[PDB]
Design a protein around this ligand. Structure first.
Ligand code: VO4
Length: 576
């Protein structure tokens, strides 16, 4: 019925998918990239993370229900009185492979299928039937490629689907990304539609693309972080007021230097004012994954990296028949993906709370003849595998979602591997190194097209400029976390403070809030080995010191989840 979209090859050993836990993570990642290529459900950063958090939670409890863990316990218990939180019981079901399969297939089906359950109005109603059909191909195919096969008649398989139903019913946020009712309030430091993509024309009817179109101003998930059910966090998380706002409105020198730096480090390639280096351009594009065709969102890359870390540091050589390895991955991916989910909730909550402007607009609309540049252009979020120009993600700047996701994800890996891969203090540089890590943004295959993307053809048969293939080696998760955060500065899409306190990542000078520059005028960063996310700030509405930027927020979120052992967010503290 549909022409299957030809997906490019993934840079990763085929041996990885011989382990059924990695297999299902993989299918989750394939659905992630395909929904961003066809415009289906669970698009965007916060919600694409949630989909992975829900998949792994279900896989987690189904597996540990059949092979009970020694230290921790299942996220939900079978003995809980509260129905919503009551885990189904196996009752003789004892096939862990089939329970995971049923749980992964059910969750992924429930998440990505055409909502025939009637309740689909306005939730995400703008998805064509092709989008749905393309995602169905991925689902059907996955049943066929699953290592060990899939037995739908199996009691263990049925038990798994039962597990998924509970998690879906409890944690699904059908209308989470609703933009309905939100409109920007222009003014200094205020988020508004970005000048290079002020409005978009979208077909009136998704199932009628070449028919009429209508103007559209997109605001990504403005009510989500403030209303959605948290996963495993045990408290609300907050950041300090960004420079220029509220209690930090007097941080004039900090703000102004942030403008200077923004221009020199994140401008477009050919601008005279751009002092960023070719290598720094690489670090910026490496971590993008900005909802592009055949690429998806950041959570997809974070997982690609985590899969690599898991195989490199596994306890047993056998990827196919090792319960030790199965247990390790089910636990790790649940921890990392639940942390990613919550990182997404809180970074989005803060974004829309402060509604801080993007550097493109903060620079153009500065208003001061000697400080602003009313015609500046950023390197921008790359629109890979399209023929479109770079863009500014459709949501406020503070804090950076990438920085939060990275802080959460990599702080989780560190807490998990400390003592296994090396030894270090909780908040100090780790030993978790990896090599041969390739980003899909720079793999010698993906490209910037010269004509609109053709979904019926392989990317290699489509004219455009190919992204240089860069194979990377990283010394630690600290470096991964750090580079992922500063990547948004090189792209010009985030202010330094959206990442972390300037004081924690930049080299100071004798002038306050003004950091070091080299001869060509480029910003000098602290060595990764020396970076400590310790600089806090104040809030107008709350007492005390709070972290600055996304990195500390994510770290804080991962520590809390881990220290509590992956346990539900108490309902008493859920948004109401
Ligand atoms: O979420 V960003 O918030 O890093 O372009």
């Amino acid at each position: 019925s549909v022409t299957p979209i030809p997906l490019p090859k993934i840079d990763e050993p085929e041996e990885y998918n011989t382990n059924y836990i990695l297999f299902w993570n993989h299918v989750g990642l394939e659905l992630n990239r395909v929904t961003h290529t066809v415009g289906g459900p669970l698009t965007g950063p916060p919600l694409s993370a949630r989909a992975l958090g829900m998949l792994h939670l279900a896989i987690h409890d189904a597996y540990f229900s059949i092979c009970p863990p020694t230290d921790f316990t299942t996220f939900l218990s079978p003995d809980t009185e509260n129905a919503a939180y009551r885990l189904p019981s196996p009752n003789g079901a004892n096939d862990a492979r089939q329970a995971v399969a049923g749980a992964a297939l059910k969750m992924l089906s429930s998440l990505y299928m055409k909502p025939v359950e009637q309740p689909n109005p306005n939730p995400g109603a703008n998805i064509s039937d092709n989008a749905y059909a393309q995602l169905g191909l991925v689902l059907d195919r996955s049943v066929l490629e699953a290592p060990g096969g899939v037995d739908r008649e199996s009691a263990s398989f049925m038990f798994g689907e039962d597990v998924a139903d509970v998690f879906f019913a409890l944690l699904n946020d059908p209308r989470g990304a609703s933009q309905e009712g939100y409109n920007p309030t222009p003014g200094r430091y205020k988020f508004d539609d970005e000048p290079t993509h002020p409005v978009v024309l979208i077909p009136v009817d998704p199932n009628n693309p070449n028919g009429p179109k209508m103007p559209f101003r997109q605001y990504h998930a403005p009510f989500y972080g403030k209303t959605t059910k948290r996963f495993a966090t045990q408290s609300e998380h907050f950041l300090a007021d960004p420079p220029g706002l509220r209690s930090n409105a007097d941080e004039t020198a900090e703000y102004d230097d942030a403008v200077r730096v923004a221009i020199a480090m994140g401008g477009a390639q050919a601008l005279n004012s751009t002092k960023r280096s070719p290598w720094q351009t690489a670090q910026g594009l490496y971590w993008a994954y900005d909802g592009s065709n055949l690429i998806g969102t950041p959570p997809r890359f974070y997982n690609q990296i985590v899969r690599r870390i898991a195989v490199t540091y596994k306890k047993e050589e056998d990827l196919a028949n090792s319960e030790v390895n199965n247990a390790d991955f089910a636990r790790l991916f649940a921890l990392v993906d639940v942390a990613c989910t919550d990182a997404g909730i809180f970074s989005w909550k803060e974004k829309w709370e402060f509604e801080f402007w993007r550097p493109l607009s903060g620079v153009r609309d500065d208003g001061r003849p000697d400080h602003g540049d009313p015609f500046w252009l950023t390197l921008g979020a790359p629109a890979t595998n399209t023929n479109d120009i770079p863009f500014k993600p459709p949501f406020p700047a503070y804090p950076s979602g990438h920085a939060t996701f990275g802080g959460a994800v990599f702080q989780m890996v560190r807490r998990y591997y400390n003592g296994r891969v090396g030894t270090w203090k909780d908040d100090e540089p780790d030993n978790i190194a990896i090599d041969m890590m390739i980003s899909e943004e720079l793999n010698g295959v993906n490209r910037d097209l010269r004509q609109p993307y053709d979904p019926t053809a392989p990317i290699e048969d489509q004219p455009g400029i190919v992204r240089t293939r860069i194979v990377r080696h990283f010394d630690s998760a600290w470096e991964l976390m750090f580079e992922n955060a500063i990547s948004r500065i090189f792209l010009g899409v985030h202010w330094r403070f959206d990442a972390a306190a300037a004081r924690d990542i930049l080299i100071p000078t004798t002038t306050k809030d003004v950091y070091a520059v080299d001869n060509n005028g480029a910003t000098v960063f602290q060595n990764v080995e020396d970076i400590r996310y310790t600089t806090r700030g104040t809030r107008e509405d709350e007492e005390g010191l709070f972290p600055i930027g996304g990195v500390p927020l994510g770290i804080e979120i991962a520590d809390e989840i881990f220290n509590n052992g992956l346990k539900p967010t108490p309902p008493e503290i859920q948004p109401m």
